[PDB]
Amino acid sequence: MALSKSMHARNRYKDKPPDFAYLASKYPDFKQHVQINLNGRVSLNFKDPEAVRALTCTLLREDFGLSIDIPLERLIPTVPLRLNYIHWVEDLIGHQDKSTLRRGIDIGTGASCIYPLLGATLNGWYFLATEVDDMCFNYAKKNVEQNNLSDLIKVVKVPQKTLLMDALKEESEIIYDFCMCNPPFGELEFVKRIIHDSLQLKKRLRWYSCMLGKKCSLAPLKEELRIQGVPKVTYTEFCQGRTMRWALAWSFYD
Ligand SMILES: Nc1ncnc2c1ncn2[C@@H]1O[C@H](CSCC[C@H](N)C(=O)O)[C@@H](O)[C@H]1O
């Protein structure tokens, strides 16, 4: 499948994208990173990671009420793009209500802990955040605690060679609804490790998903899943102008 306006229909920033002028007038700690371009427009220098951090932290504060602390030394996520994936998963696990508790896994949560944070806020989803990087693990366990989401999000430091399988030994939950992953920059080799772990977990997770960075990666993975005889295999492409990612998910369910 593929979504109109190249991004998910339920995305906040599809109809109402970020307004630099507005955010500068509200958050004077963001006003410092914004500069007036030639066209008179209020613009952020996307090269400066401190500027980009200021935007991402402000959009979380402004639109989700999330106050996060993230280091420059680590990846700065781009709020609207990550949000498409949150909505795609919503669609996959057939969102719809108050007594229907849905639980997922985030393979590589990052310093931000962006997916579990959005996910637990927007929908109240229980998450199992995994991390190999200590710095990332420290900041994520911190952002979760400071937004009092300690109850829904369970951040866990994990060994290097370990993925999905190994992580589901603490805690012991029978059925997980989804698992999202944003592979770090071979890419194909990573999702292949996810595919394999999914072959042994099968119906224990309703949906296994992966946000890809390269379109070339879709063709072999689509073929791998097909060779392994995976019943449902779904894919889409998201967008944020210059940026473009390819989310792919697969289920063993009829
Ligand atoms: N085998 C593995 N298991 C768990 N986490 C891993 C891992 N390999 C890498 N990671 C971690 O996963 C992260 C990938 S970056 C994805 C971060 C986040 N979801 C975002 O979009 O902001 C890194 O912080 C890295 O330390």
Residue numbers in the entry: 1 to 96, 99 to 187, 223 to 291
What's in the article?
METTL16 is the second m6A methyltransferase identified, and its known substrates include U6 snRNA and the human MAT2A mRNA that encodes for S-adenosylmethionine (SAM) synthetase (Pendleton et al., 2017). Here we describe the crystal structure of human METTL16 to reveal a methyltransferase domain furnished with an extra N-terminal module, which together form a deep-cut groove that is essential for RNA binding. Consistent with the SAM-dependent methyltransferase activity of METTL16, both structures reveal a Rossmann fold composed of a central seven-stranded β sheet (strands β3–β9) flanked by three α helices each (helices α4–α6 and α7–α9). In contrast, we show here that METTL16 is active as a monomer, and it contains a large deep-cut groove that can accommodate structured RNAs.
Two constructs (core, 1–291 aa; and ΔN, 40–291 aa) encompassing the methyltransferase domain (MTase) were expressed in E. coli and crystallized (Star Methods). First, and most striking, is the presence of an N-terminal module (1–78 aa) in the core structure that is appended to the α4 of the Rossmann fold and that consists of three helices (α1–α3) and two short β strands (β1 and β2). Taken together, our two structures reveal an architecture where the MTase domain is attached to a METTL16-specific N-terminal module that is essential for activity. Indeed, when mapped onto the METTL16-core structure, these reveal a positively charged cluster (K5, R10, R12, K14, K16, and R41) that forms the entrance of a wide deep-cut groove. With additional contributions from the N-terminal module (K47 and R74) and those from within the Rossmann fold (R82, R279, and R282), the groove runs all the way to the catalytic pocket containing the bound SAH. The residues K47 and R279 serve to constrict the space within this groove, while R74 overlooks the ridge that surrounds the SAH-binding pocket. The complexed byproduct of the SAM-dependent methylation reaction, S-adenosyl homocysteine (SAH), is coordinated by a hydrogen bond interaction network with the highly conserved amino acid residues R82, D108, G110, T111, S114, E133, Q162, N184, and R230. While 20 residues between Q191 and T212 are not visible in the ΔN structure, a much larger region (35 residues) between F187 and G223 lacks density in the core structure. The full-length METTL16 and the core domain versions were able to methylate this RNA (RNA6) at a specific adenosine residue (A17) within the nonamer UACAGAGAA motif. Strikingly, a combined mutant with all five residues converted to alanine (MUT1: K5A, R10A, R12A, K14A, and K16A) completely eliminated RNA methylation activity.
